[PDB]
Design a protein around this ligand. Structure first.
Ligand SMILES: *C(=O)c1ccc(CCN)cc1
Lengths: 8, 87
């Protein structure tokens, strides 16, 4: 979870 | 792997249908972490989880920060050409 995730 | 060009078709009412992770501030390229079922990336057939997005419609995504990439990718419309590589 250290990295960001974006739904696009 | 090899650098690939992949065409995606979408209309203005929908998103790309991908989740992305990474970005320069994390020392990771912009990576596809999810392909959502039935949405444009899934439908186009040539984009895969684990692909790094190097450019979209000739707009560079190399060494972009996470949110920079979100703005660039979400601005693209219609017939969209991805430059991707699977590592
Ligand atoms: C996102 O594009 C997305 C998430 C979940 C689904 C399943 C719908 N039940 C479709 C598309």
């Amino acid at each position: 979870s250290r990295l960001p995730t974006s739904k696009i | 792997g090899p650098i690939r060009k992949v065409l995606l078709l979408k209309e203005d009412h929908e998103g790309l249908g991908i989740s992305i992770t990474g970005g320069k501030e994390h020392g990771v390229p912009i990576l596809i972490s999810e392909i959502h079922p039935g949405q444009p990336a899934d439908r186009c057939g040539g984009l895969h989880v684990g692909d790094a997005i190097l450019a979209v419609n000739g707009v560079n995504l190399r060494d972009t920060k996470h949110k920079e990439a979100v703005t660039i990718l979400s601005q693209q419309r219609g017939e969209i050409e991805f430059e991707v590589v699977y590592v």
